[PDB]
């Protein structure tokens, strides 16, 4: 049940039953933690952190060896972005759609998609303000959205 679509896909990742560090691995916990910190300074999103670590370095799930989620590790070590990754990606997509619309005003489909993205951004922002991830006076303005992204 897609929130803004009629699709009913169920594609996802099925984590293993064994919630333990890998039997054949030498991650050494702290080495991976500093490795994540190095990649965070390099400037890649936590999704890219897990993808690169799983595909190349060979750690299936980082929390299995580290004991905490990578976002928790980044927050604990201080490299915590002010805007959450999902909200940042949504606002960046909205900015790209708005730029496309302002250069090409006849794209009614893009206008409809911008409305959907705007609604999704507002719902996500309301959730984050309620939980406390963002200041209660966060708000979202299209004029300053470009400065918010950059």
């Amino acid at each position: 049940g897609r929130m803004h679509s009629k699709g009913k896909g169920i594609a996802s990742s099925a984590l293993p039953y064994v919630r333990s560090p890998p039997a054949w691995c030498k991650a050494d916990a702290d080495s991976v933690v500093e490795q994540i910190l190095k990649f965070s300074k390099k400037g890649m999103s936590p999704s890219q952190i897990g993808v690169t670590l799983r595909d190349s370095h060979g750690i299936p799930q980082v929390r299995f060896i580290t004991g905490q989620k990578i976002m928790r590790i980044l927050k604990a070590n201080g490299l915590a972005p002010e805007l959450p990754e999902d909200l940042y990606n949504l606002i960046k997509k909205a900015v790209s759609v708005r730029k496309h619309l302002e250069r090409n005003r006849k794209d009614k489909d893009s206008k409809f998609r911008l409305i959907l993205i705007e609604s999704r951004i507002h719902r996500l922002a309301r959730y984050y303000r309620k939980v406390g991830a963002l200041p209660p006076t966060w708000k979202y303005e299209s004029a300053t959205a470009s400065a918010l992204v950059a």
């Binding site: 984590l15 039953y17 919630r19």
Partner: protein, 129 residues
């Protein structure tokens, strides 16, 4: 989206019983589902059930033996006092001797008859006969 898991469990069980199958797989599982099933088990309508403990809500495989006609849920959870138990029994049960109404009494999930014995009302969960 999913609203109540007991309703889905009872709908699947009654569908399997009507089809005539001797087993049914229920997902998701919960404490309310477990308490409902043990009440049905101590009353003899449902045989052994194995709770598959996953690192999730968890699944359960139930062995049936027929002898039940329909198990259903009562949504919303109406508040049932001691005096309203008879009215609910007349409204839902086939007769005064056959049929069980499950109430989430403050003492715990229990049948309407033993809820009367304990002299405590609650909220109506469902029924089976």
């Amino acid at each position: 989206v999913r609203q109540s898991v007991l309703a889905d469990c009872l709908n699947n069980i009654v569908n399997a019983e009507r089809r005539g199958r001797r087993q049914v797989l229920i997902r998701p599982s919960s404490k309310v589902i477990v308490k409902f099933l043990t009440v049905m088990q101590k009353h003899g309508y449902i045989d052994e059930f194995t709770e598959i403990d996953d690192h999730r809500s968890g699944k359960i495989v139930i062995q049936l033996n027929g002898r039940i006609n329909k198990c259903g849920v009562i949504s919303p959870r109406f508040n049932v006092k001691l005096k309203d138990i008879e009215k609910w029994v007349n409204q839902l049960l086939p007769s005064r001797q056959v049929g069980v109404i499950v109430l989430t009494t403050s003492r715990g999930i229990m049948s309407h008859n033993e809820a009367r014995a304990k002299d405590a009302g609650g909220k109506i969960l469902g029924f089976f006969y």
